[PDB]
Every structure is written in structure tokens, then in C-alpha cells.
Design a protein around this nucleic acid. Structure first.
Lengths: 85, 112, 50, 251
RNA sequence: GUAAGCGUUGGAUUGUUCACCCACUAAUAGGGAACGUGAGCUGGGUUUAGACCGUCGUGAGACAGGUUAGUUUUACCCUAC
RNA sequence: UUAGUGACGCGCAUGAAUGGAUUAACGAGAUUCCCACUGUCCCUAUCUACUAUCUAGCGAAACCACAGCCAAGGGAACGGGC
RNA sequence: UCUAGUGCAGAUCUUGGUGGUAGUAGCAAAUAUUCAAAUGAGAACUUUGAAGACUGAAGUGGGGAAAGGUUCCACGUCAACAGCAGUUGGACGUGGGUUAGUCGAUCCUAAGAGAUGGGGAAGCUCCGUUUCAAAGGCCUGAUUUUAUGCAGGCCACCAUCGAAAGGGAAUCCGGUUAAGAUUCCGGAACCUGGAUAUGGAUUCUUCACGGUAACGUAACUGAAUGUGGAGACGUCGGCGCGAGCCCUGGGAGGAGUUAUCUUUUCUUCUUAACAGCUUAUCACCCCGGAAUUGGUUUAUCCGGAGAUGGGGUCUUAUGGCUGGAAGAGGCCAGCACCUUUGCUGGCUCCGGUGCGCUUGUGACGGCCCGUGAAAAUCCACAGGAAGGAAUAGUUUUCAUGCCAGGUCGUACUGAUAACCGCAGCAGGUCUCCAAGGUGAACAGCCUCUAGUUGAUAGAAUAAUGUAGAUAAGGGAAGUCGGCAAAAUAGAUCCGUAACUUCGGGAUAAGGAUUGGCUCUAAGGGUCGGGUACGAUCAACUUAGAACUGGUACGGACAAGGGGAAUCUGACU
RNA sequence: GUGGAGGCUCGUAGCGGUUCUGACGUGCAAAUCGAUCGUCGAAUUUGGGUAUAGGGGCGAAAGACUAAUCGAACCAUCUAGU
RNA sequence: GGCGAGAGACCGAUAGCGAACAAGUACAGUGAUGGAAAGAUGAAAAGAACUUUGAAAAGAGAGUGAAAAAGUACGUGAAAUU
RNA sequence: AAACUUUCAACAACGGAUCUCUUGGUUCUCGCAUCGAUGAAGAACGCAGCGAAAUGCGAUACGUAAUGUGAAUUGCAGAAUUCCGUGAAUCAUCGAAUCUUUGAACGCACAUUGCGCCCCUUGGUAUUCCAGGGGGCAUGCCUGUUUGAGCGUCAUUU
């Protein structure tokens, strides 16, 4: 009964949600995410996990500041305001 | 022959989930959770229950009064009366015997 | 379960607010390529995995 | 080939000691000033059973000389000790059972236990049930005391080293058979995970050096050198002789 | 000799084919058909994996050497009947 | 009675903690015999229920070069085709 | 002219699509459905009613943990799903719904995980968790530029995380909704924290009296520090006690049956959390001084280390009376109305039994080379810093009074349809409550409350199957092999071999009996006696005798085949 | 007589999984169904928490188990490996 | 790679980035990781008024449109198969 | 002879090839150098008169302000003074702001929407208790300040 009845015995989550990635990879008994490396400082990445990088990298989100960075570089990082020509 | 339920979310028969069946004014049964029972205080010396002390859980030993937790005797709600008697006697007697040892050494050392 | 956590309940509420069909005025709008919802989710078929 | 049982035993996730019900470490009082210049009285308040240990223990209580305080210690009880019993520890103490005299203070043929081999270790040699150390003689000049240890061995320690007088309680424990895998089971249930024991010769050769074959047999010899390594050491390590003991040890 | 028309057994032991005895019989003849016949059976034997003995081998392991335990699938199609 | 049991023993190649010999009790262990019991068999028959069957509705799969009558011949030495 | 990703029949080729097989196999476990009405276009299945059946309290019942996530409830509604159907649905669409000081989390720590200091490591990071570290905050205040320093004093654990089943402060009844409730409404309580006033108590003997004592009380100072207890604990056995359930007698009510019989069959007669007055086995005290030894348990332990005895103190588990509380709730009757619809009356009483069931508990015993968590938290005690009365003080562990009590969860299933198994899978998945009879028995069979009546149907009844049964005469000849099935079977009485580690073997083997009815006998409790008995009460057990029957009776269910020997491993 | 021990025994639940080498074997099911069986107060059964991680663990030892995967798991890459 | 610009003897929806579309999406797996399919009505919705059969869905007419041999199962509309 | 099988064609079907398209991809070239403790990349949850998603955004929430243009957005509804104007608009540009809970994540923690300490202020007759609001408390290191410690050490006291 290594198959079906054991799958019936299967009901306790090894993994739950993580607060840095939100992916349900936070091993409770180790206290680590299997995807971001929480609660470590760094973010978990590998150059064999190219797809993983591509999935979790810059630009898959809002870039709440970084789009405006390039706009602002174009305008030369200016202070002040307009003058009502 | 009505059958009843744990009145809470713990379904296992542990010491903190003792129930007692009871018949209510509806004519019906209900399960009524009973708290664990208190164990009497003991004398620190012999290890025996001591009397004139209420039997309670230890924060009910806060809400109750000094009359329930104590007796009118020295070493009141802490030691047995007989152990008290014993140590009183022992105190008196070995103090006297220390006096006697002192004077024996006194007279001996003074003679020699 | 009954004894649950607020995060779970939060995600559940969000799911419940997602689980309903398209608006037909969105079906009416200009240049529209949507006919139906395809992020639709039913407890019998697929689980959230939370 | 695999790593074998004796090698897994050293990481020890499951092989660690089951150390719950043990009342504490059974060490002697510390050797501060009162012990090494006079004596001091405590009282055996209660004898109890230590789990995993066949020799009982004796919750003794002393007084702190430096503070209104009641530092309680744990001693291994010798045969004859009882409750309410005054224990005298120190140098000018008297030679009766339960006292903690030093070996320069005891004479020859004296019978002690829970002895130190280095003063200040707070308890060592002769800690198990039924066992004792025998004083042999002295060399006060070069203050050293010869002692016979239960192995049958001879050792030379500081005469300033301590030791309780008498023999440890619980003696005659192994004079009785168990009859039962269950008795053994519970014993080790409280000691550690070293029970049951499978035989390498019944294992497979991936699992043990003695393993494998179309019969249970060792093949090479079961006498291994001490200059062997982890995974080679399964049998009789560094054995000088072998087989049945045909006469005196001649030690 | 013509003759295969008709028949040619029940059992003890053996996994047995083969053999060897008991007995009846009219007779207890030999063979073939993918050494007939496993989507017809059985699975006792050999012939996976567990295990034991002996001998051999330093050893893992070997043995037409013995012993014991060990999943036998599908037809509703064409044909034949 | 190639089985079983007791005995014999120049034992291919028994044998002593590679444990030897024995052994009450125990055993979903292996084996033989006896009593009872029986459709295991002589030697087969009958009954019951659900199926198969017919019908309404629903409705798959394995497989498929093309396909589907035989004999013999020869042939890659056993063919549905020649 | 140039240039290529340039031409397919194949590659068990890739992707997609389509077929024959084939309207075929097949939709068959879980004892089982039928009649009518209503709706609707349409009913084998939806709804109702009637009937027949099942699960049969170790249940297809009622509630939960993990998990699931809104399936919960309602309205509409049937294109797809519910391997037939569909007017129905865990489906589709639209909405609604989960109320806490007292239930949990939060707190505590367990196994353990893991920073700091430090040390290793090229480095990601590893070790270690009190460590070779200068590792901090607790109280009284003192001043009255003034907030909080300075006056002191105290102490040295030395992060944090870790249990929705462990420990732990405190809530119950009735009612109520489409769906929630120990949460909401009404009523009645408790706890923590913080404020504070009066009363009470106490004091001129400054911080209480009584008691021989056990110890009692409405209260009746007490810092630092320190000691002790509770928290805090295995398992089994039998005994006692209690609660609830079961059984039962009378009586007051309603329903049922009633050709006949039946003072009959069924059912309601209930009382919470909390508070007060009382109540216990154990234990302890006083008087007293035991052999002719006595007391006493089911179980044999206790006594000059002071028994029996007489008298008394305590623990309040637990019960009883009262309050809460009859005003609720329940059972009935009567009179009213489109109706919101009620309105008014009565009863709601007194008991008995038991190796009964479950459970809790108490005192004992037995087992161990096994002696069966910790911490938080709380309390008490020793001690005596300090502080206070008299024309007035001190106390707030006594009573009363005041305020507040957050955050998150809370619906529902918990499984032959809500979890996991690709699914509406005969699988698997932790647990609590548990009626009557038979019977040793939460065995099997039947039934009540509660719940289901679901699994594609109809007509026929061939072979073959699967599952279940029987078969003369024989009785393992069958077969590798007695595989399979059969016989045996419970209980009482009798009888019991070899061998043996002397404990067993042994239900050895092997035999007899067993129903129903009418009788008998024996086995018990409570009360009565100046300083041999008698009256009353009530149980199930055992043995026996007549009578009887189509020699039947552990009448169904349930329920061992045995013996002689060997090889082997001692056993579980 | 009492008493009520035991890794005792019969035998429910429960845990298991002997035999039928039964059913099913394009199944109810990627190991189930039915009967027959073993054990059933202990080396018992079991939930939750916790530790052990791949030449590593764990193993009353079968080369067994380590997420339907084990005589060395799974994922990706080296890798369009030869 | 990022930001911004331009180009091509390149691919032209089984091609070209896995992704011309609500694509690192749905979905699977405990998890690491894995990882799709899916473009076109018509110039313009003018997306079929109204009648009739039917319980309705739909049908037959009507009508729009250049065209319903363009009717959201929409450009054309092959083959297998029917 | 039908039926049936097969073949061919017409029409209808299944199905989605072929053809023709194309806000995409790929490759080459050119140019520029710009994330973050002043809190990034990313994640979670949430915001629209009527949205699930995408894109946008953060309780000032498909956006505010400011600037420029110059009267639309559009599926519906609504709005109109907003039209010879400090002014429409899912507009473009963007220099001022908001920037939930998180995250290097920084008061301590975390499977808890958990538990604290300090300052200011308000209420509850309150330094202490409760609640509300505002502001704050990470670590290592640098320079500097203040307070220190140590017979490590100097001088000078009487």
C-alpha cells in the first residue's frame, strides 16, 4: 500500500507561504524558503536556474521606482518646477 | 438515552477535557467540562497533607483569604504540627547540649 | 480549517472575489478579444495550494 | 560501500543519550576552602533512582558559607547511607561512610568511591553500582596515592584528591538474568539507542565488512589493528590474545 | 498373413516423462499431430528476487549438488467449429 | 511405497559458540501416518441470486500493412495471399 | 541571373485530427422498492403523503482535529457535469451569512531549533547557546531652579522560537435565525487589571481573639533575603463511593389497541454556572494504658515509637437543603380568528433496587537492572527593615461600591460526494457520546430515538461464469499435496496418556446431558430486647423432582477437528 | 479457601496479511474485494511536534525504506554527453 | 543585460523568443523545478426588426449586407473520415 | 432485384491544412550610462459609478499636484460649466507629493496581522493603570563629543 492508501495518509503540509516571495515554499521545520532563501539576507538564485531567474527577476513586477529612474536621467535629475510660460 | 458532544473544539480525552454529563432545565443532557482537581498542600518535612488548609488551584489560592491558606501556628501552612514540635524540641535540646560542650571545653582548658 | 490564520483567510477572500464571471459590457467594448474568463476556479476541480 | 552503524553512531541524532528523567549530574561538592582546610556538614535529605543508572543518588544539602543559601548537591549513594544523614566533607573530617575525605587523610586498605583522579573534577572513578577503589599506600613526599581500580588496575593520583568512603549502592544488579528482550528494551529505552544489535555477518557487504557470502561467515579475521580506520574496525580492536580465558590474567 | 473396424484400465511411491510393484482384465500394444494441447487448467519440478546445509574460493561469490517459501494477464475482432 | 520412521556407517563433502548432540513448551514453518469428516473422486445431477441474453438510454479501449476457406508443393527448410 | 532552413510514404518520428473495432465490451458489490397526488412541456429517480425495508448506539446517528475553502442558506435555473434520466443537486447565475473579558491562539516551557560574544572558513556560511565577554534592571525615594538626576539599597538568571491533544485566571440556563452562537437577546455569575469611598475589623497593652490540642474565624501590619508546597504526572488489578444512563412501583395527564383479554402498551413529570448552611474515606488530637493479645481488609496489615475504645478537629472530591428557579422549560385542557394571531387555566409529585453500563474519584495492592517531563504562574512560611494610636489613628488578602477588558479564528463537510488518491474511485485518514432484548459479551440477530431508502432501469430465466447450498452407496481411490469444503463447536458433570525445564501438556484424548411447564430446597438486608426469637423488606444464582412433546431442545445466530511421530527454530 | 501474576492463553474492536495460489485482473482499485487466518495488555497500536539528507541517512538486516522512484532519490545544468 | 534609435536577400502563428492573444499565464508537483494551447466576421454590427411552428433551444420565412457560398460553432475552408 | 460493401462525382458535415495577411520575434549596427538605508528588485493585500484579468496605482489608491496642448472619454450611465477658457481628456510631459503590509528590512519576533520600552499630547477625577493620535528604539564600522575603567602609568600634594 505504498501508493493509494498512503496518499490517503497524506495530509500535513511540509511547506507553507513565505513573506518574501509568496510561493508556498517555506519549510516549517527548517525555517527556509526553497525559492528565495528566506530568512537569509540574499535572494536564492543559480545560473543553472536560468528560467528561475527569468521568472523572479527585475521587470516581472511593478518597478515602482525604476521606470521613473530612466525618465529622470533623461531629464538630468532636475529639481524645482515649471514657470508658466 | 441521549448522547452528547464535547462542548469545545478539542476532541480528545485529555486531562484538561474531562467532561461530566448533566441534566439541564430543558429536560435534556449536556456535557459540562470539569476542571482538574486540586492536590492538597504538603508538609515540606514529612511529605504529608496538612489540615486546616483549603484545597484549590494555585490562583484560587490568590483569590481566597488568609484564613483558608494558613493556621494560627508558627510554620502555619508550610509544615506539619508534629514536625514543628519535633524541631522545637531539637532546637532547645541541642542548644542546651552546645552550652554543655562549651563549659566542658571551658573547664578542661582552664584546668590545663 | 476552522482554526485558521489571517493570511489564509485573506487569500480565501481574494479568491472568492475572483471566482465570478466576466462583465458583459466588457464583452461589448471596442477592440475586445475577451469572450470568457479563464482564471476561473472551482473548489471541486483545482485547489489553491496555500 | 556504505557508512556503517558504528560510524553513524558518532554523529548521533538518534544515538544521543535519553537525558530527560535524570535528576542531574552526580558530582561532588566543589573543592573550595572549607574542604581543603577543615570540614563541613551537610544532610542527606532524600535518596532517589536515577534513570539509566543502576546506582541510586542522594540529594544532599549543604549551606553556603558565603551567603544565606542552601546549595544542594547530588551524590551517588553508598551502601549504608540513609535519609536524614549527616555527611561530613573535608580534610579534618572523620572516617565514616558517606564522608568525602581525601586519600592522604585515609589509611591503607580503605574503601572509597566517586573518586577524583584530578582534584576539582567533582567526581570520577568508582561511580557505578557495587564498585569501589582500594587505597594501597602513599608517597606523601611527592604527594601521591596508589589505588586499585575495579578493572584490577593500579593508578597514582594526588593525595589531595577526594572520594566518598564506602561502596556504591545498587550492588548485585547483574547477578540477575533479565529473561526478556522487553526488560532489555526498557533498560536501553532509558539509556540510549544501542539495542537491538544486528550481526554484520548477517548483513550484506555494503553494510558491514563481515557481511555477505553464501553462508554467515567472516572471511578474514575479526582481530583488527589500532592502526586501522573507521569502517575497518568491526570486531576485536587491537586484541592481544583471544578465545577462552585459560587461567590467570597474569596482570 | 489380410487387417487400425473396435478397444487398450484401476492404483502405492516419485514433480516426473521413464521406471517399479499390487490387482482386475479379453488385452492391459507402440507412436504422431510446433518433442499436440498454459488468452484450456494446474504450477508439483526446473528457472529471478528471501533463506539453510555441504564442498570450493582469501573474499565477494560458484555448484546438471540438495532443501524450503515464492503474482500464470487479455477475446467483445477475422476464420474455423 | 523412489515417500515416512527406526537402525547400520571407511561419511564424494558430518562434527563441536563456522557451535555439536538432545530437548518440554511453542509454530499461518516443512513432512509422513491414523480416526472422524466429507461432491476431491467414482459420476455427475438439481436449486437460488447477480450476470451473460433481449430492450430503452449512455457508451469506451487493446489492436489494425491489406486482409481474412482449405490440402500439398516449393520457398528464409511450418503461407491468408504465390 | 542570385541565394537557401528548398521537394517525404515510412523514422515503435513530432504535433494536431480522424476512423474501423462498435451502437460493441459494458454501466451487475454495499438485502429494496412500490401506490397515488402536486409541479412541470416532459417524471422509474424532484417534493409530499401512505406502505415496505435497512443502518441497529464499535450506527448509513449526533459533534470535532488535520485538510478543504464558502461547498453552508435562500431565490432563480438546466446549455455543459451528476459515465441512464432530471422539473433535482456539493452543478450554473445572483446574493446573504461566521458577533466572545470567560472557547482557543496569544503566555509557559519539552524534545529541540537558533542570533549575540568569540572562534573557523577563499567564501556562500559553519560551531556553539553560557560559552576564555566590562553582556543589567528592581525598588524606597531626594528635591521641591525640576523634571527626574542625585542619596543610597537590591540582586546577577544572563536572547528568542518551539504544543490550537501537554501546563494554564475566569460562563451557565432558556430563547432566537434561511443559514451563527458556551459569542447574539433576556436573566443570573465569575476572573484579571486599575482606581477609590463608606461600612466592618483593630489600637491608649500600639499591629486580633477562642481552643488542653488537633485546629476555628468575616477581617485581624510585615520589606530585603531565604525555605517549602501546589503546578507535577506511569501502568494494571479488584473493592468502595458518587454522577449520568438503564430497570422499576404508585400517582396526575395525553396518545394507542380493545371480536376476546389486558388496574394494560407508549410517553411528560426536568432543574444548569455560581453562592450560602451542611456532609468523607484517609489523616490528626485529648483521656487512657493493651497477652487470656486485640482491631480489621475482598485482598493481612497495624499497635508501649501508645492499639481497641470514648470524645473531638480537618481536607469539601462528592452528594443533600435553600437561593439561582419556575417566572423558564416540558405535558395537557379550554375559548378565540382572513389575520399581527394569541388569551386563560391546571399538573410539573413521592419513591425502590442492582457484582448492571459508561465515566470520575478515593483508599490499598501488584510490576520493574523500566520507579513512570519541564517551565511559567500562584501560595504559604521563617525573618524582622520599616512604618504608624488617642480627641485620634492604622488596616483595604473581610463585605459593598466604580471603570475597562484589546488582536486573530468562529459558517459547513469531516467523508461509499466537500480531505488525498488525475474523479461524485468499494481504497486510505486522529477522535468523543453510545438505549431495550437474547446472550458471558459496545460479538452475531431483532427493535426504539436519529438518519437513509442513495448505487442506470424494465422483460425473460439458455449455455458459461462468480457468490451461495444440497446430494443416495462408497469415503481421499482424487490430487504434487486431503487444496477446497465438511464434520467439530457454547455451557454443566465425569475422565484425562506419554513426556516434562515439574511450571505444563490439557478444552489432551474421550463420553453423557441441555427445551418448556409446575414445584421444592438452599443461599440475604433493616429493625426491635432489665443494668432463644420476632416484624418487615428485596434480589438473582445454584442444585434437584414430577409432567409433557412425532427423542426434540447451545433448535436460528454464534461456535475448536483430533491423535502418533520426524526435520527445523527454543519461546513472545 | 483467599488472592489475582504472566513480553500466559481463547477470542472482539484494533494492528496485520497465511491460504483460497478464490473474485477482479483494458478492475471499485497503478495492490482492491470476499471468506479463511495470525496477534490482541505487550519488543502494543497510533496522531501531532521534533532530529537524521543522497555515496548520505535510517535499517529487530529484506540490499529493505528514503513522497506510486532505490544494488545509491528527485530538480536543473555541464548536455544537442559518446 | 539595461535605456533609447535605425535596419535586414531572416521567421511568418506546428515557423520565429517558451510567450504576435489577460505567457512565465492557466495547469501539475510537498518542493526545488516544470510549463502549454490559443491570431483573422465584415469597409461598417448594419450581429438578423416582424410573422409563424415549437415548452424552449432552434427551425422556416422575412430582412441587413457587395456577399450569410461571410451568421461570433464567423476569411478562404484541403484530406483522412462521413 | 433490393439492402449491404467498395469506387467516382455533386451538395451537406467533421476538421482546420492551403493561400493571403501581421501592433510580434530574431539577428546586425549606432548611441547613453541611470537601482538601493533619502529604504531598492521582488512579494502580499487592496483601489474604479458598473471589472474577474491585463496594464496602472497605494486609504490623497486605473490615480493628486505642477507644465503643455487645447474640448474630449466612450460599452453603458452620468457630468456639463468644463468651452473666445487658470481648461475637457484612460492625453502627452513630469521637476512637488502620497507612497497600505512587507522585503537588504532595521525595536524583539513570525506558520502569531503577536509582544514590548522611551518622548510629546488628549480622554478616562491618574508620573505608575487603560485606550487613542503623533514621533521614535537594529547591527558592524569611521571621525568627533560626553561619561568612564584599569598601581598600565606620570606628576604634584601634605
Amino acid at each position: 500500500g505504498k501508493g493509494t492508501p498512503s496518499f490517503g495518509k497524506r495530509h500535513n503540509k511540509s511547506h507553507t507561504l513565505c513573506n518574501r516571495c509568496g510561493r508556498r515554499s517555506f519549510h516549517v521545520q527548517k525555517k527556509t524558503c526553497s525559492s528565495c532563501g528566506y530568512p537569509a539576507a540574499k535572494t536564492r538564485s543559480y545560473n543553472w536556474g536560468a528560467k528561475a531567474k527569468r521568472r523572479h527577476t527585475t521587470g516581472t513586477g511593478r518597478m515602482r521606482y525604476l521606470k521613473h529612474v530612466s525618465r529622470r536621467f533623461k531629464n538630468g535629475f532636475q529639481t524645482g518646477s515649471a514657470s508658466k510660460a | 438515552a441521549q448522547r452528547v458532544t464535547f462542548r469545545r473544539r478539542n476532541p480528545y480525552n485529555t486531562r484538561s477535557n474531562k467532561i461530566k454529563v448533566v441534566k439541564t432545565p430543558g429536560g435534556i443532557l449536556r456535557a459540562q467540562h470539569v476542571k482538574k482537581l486540586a492536590t492538597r498542600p504538603k508538609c515540606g518535612d514529612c511529605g504529608s497533607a496538612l489540615q486546616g488548609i483549603s484545597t484549590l488551584r494555585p490562583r484560587q489560592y490568590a483569590t481566597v483569604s488568609k484564613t483558608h491558606k494558613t493556621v494560627s501556628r508558627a510554620y502555619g501552612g508550610s509544615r506539619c504540627a508534629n514536625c514543628v514540635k519535633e524541631r522545637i524540641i531539637r532546637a532547645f535540646l541541642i542548644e542546651e547540649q552546645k552550652i554543655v560542650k562549651k563549659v566542658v571545653k571551658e573547664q578542661t582548658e582552664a584546668a590545663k | 480549517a476552522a482554526q485558521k490564520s489571517f493570511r489564509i483567510k485573506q487569500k480565501m477572500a481574494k479568491a472568492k472575489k475572483q471566482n465570478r464571471p466576466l462583465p458583459q459590457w466588457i464583452r461589448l467594448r471596442t477592440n475586445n478579444t475577451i469572450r470568457y474568463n479563464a482564471k476561473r476556479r472551482n473548489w471541486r476541480r483545482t485547489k489553491m495550494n496555500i | 560501500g556504505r557508512v556503517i552503524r558504528n560510524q553513524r553512531k558518532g554523529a548521533g541524532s538518534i544515538f544521543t543519550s535519553h537525558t530527560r528523567l535524570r535528576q542531574g549530574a552526580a558530582k561532588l561538592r566543589t573543592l573550595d576552602y572549607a574542604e581543603r582546610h577543615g570540614y563541613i556538614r551537610g544532610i542527606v535529605k532524600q535518596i532517589v533512582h536515577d534513570s539509566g543508572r543502576g546506582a541510586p543518588l542522594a540529594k544532599v544539602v549543604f549551606r553556603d558559607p558565603y551567603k544565606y543559601r542552601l546549595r544542594e548537591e547530588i551524590f551517588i549513594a553508598n551502601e549504608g547511607v540513609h535519609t536524614g544523614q549527616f555527611i561530613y566533607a573535608g580534610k579534618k573530617a572523620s572516617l565514616n561512610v558517606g564522608n568525602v575525605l581525601p586519600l592522604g587523610s585515609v589509611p591503607e586498605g580503605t574503601i572509597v568511591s566517586n573518586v577524583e583522579e584530578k582534584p576539582g573534577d567533582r567526581g570520577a572513578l568508582a561511580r557505578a553500582s557495587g564498585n569501589y577503589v582500594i587505597i594501597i599506600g602513599h608517597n606523601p613526599d611527592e604527594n601521591k596515592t596508589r589505588v586499585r581500580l575495579p578493572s584490577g588496575a593500579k593508578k597514582v593520583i594526588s593525595s589531595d584528591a577526594r572520594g566518598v568512603i564506602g561502596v556504591i549502592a545498587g550492588g548485585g544488579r547483574v547477578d540477575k538474568p533479565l529473561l526478556k528482550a522487553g526488560r532489555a528494551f526498557h533498560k536501553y529505552r532509558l539509556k540510549r539507542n544501542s539495542w537491538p544489535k544486528t550481526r554484520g555477518v548477517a548483513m550484506n557487504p555494503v553494510d558491514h565488512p563481515h557481511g555477505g557470502g553464501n553462508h554467515q561467515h567472516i572471511g578474514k579475521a575479526s582481530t583488527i589493528s589500532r592502526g586501522a580506520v573507521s569502517g575497518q574496525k568491526a570486531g576485536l580492536i587491537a586484541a592481544r590474545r583471544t578465545g577462552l580465558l585459560r587461567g590467570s590474567q597474569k596482570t
